[PDB]
Amino acid sequence: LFPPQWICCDIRYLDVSILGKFAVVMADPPWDIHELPYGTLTDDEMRRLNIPVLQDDGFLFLWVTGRAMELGRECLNLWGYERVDEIIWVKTNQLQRIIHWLNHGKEHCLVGVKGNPQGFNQGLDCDVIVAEVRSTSHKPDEIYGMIERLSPGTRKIELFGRPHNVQPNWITLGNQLDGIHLLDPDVVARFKQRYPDGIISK
Ligand SMILES: CC1(C)CCN(Cc2ccc(C(=O)NC[C@]3(O)CCCN(c4cc(NCc5ccccc5)ncn4)C3)c(O)c2)CC1
Q1: Cα of 64 to ligand 1 centre, how many Å?
Q2: Atom 36 (ligand 1): residue with closest C-alpha?
Q3: Domain locations in the chain as residue ranges
């Protein structure tokens, strides 16, 4: 249901079974790679998220860094995906120049597959993004274009997004979103039923 939708919530506690199935899931988690930042999930919390109910056939896009390069592979496998690709984003300035043992010129995004997705435009884009580091901790807007060309029109879901990530054809989840904005009638129905007083607790 085309326009941007979102739910401000604690992704640990949302009953995501109300949301339906998605052709693409994207996640950019607050990994515990530093227990400092306000919203960090522990490794068990990451592992224990109910990603498996969100899709039957389609793709998962999982931003990873540091030791989450390993842990995200683990979660991806535990959640029932095979990792079939890996996108890297080469971070440049506005003049197209690049930005422990080595300085880091790129972010990594894992691509996992579940089931047998049919009718996707595999092979349209290459596994390398080149884009300007806009704000810190922002992901490049180009990922949505690649995902839309890969699976045009389909329903998509982002976990741990921020208000700037809300997109048409996407439902965005995070705890710094402005309230709850839903328009897909099926989703609105199930949300009112699961959450008749609009609170998302426990
Ligand atoms: C360079 C990259 C392409 C790759 C790496 N990237 C790192 C990055 C940076 C920033 C964020 C971020 O700012 N995300 C929005 C949050 O709001 C922030 C706080 C948490 N967060 C929750 C957390 C949540 N439950 C857990 C909870 C625990 C304790 C207290 C309250 C909640 N439920 C719902 N959202 C999500 C982000 O996701 C990943 C950057 C881009």
Answers
A1: 12
A2: 160
A3: 1-202
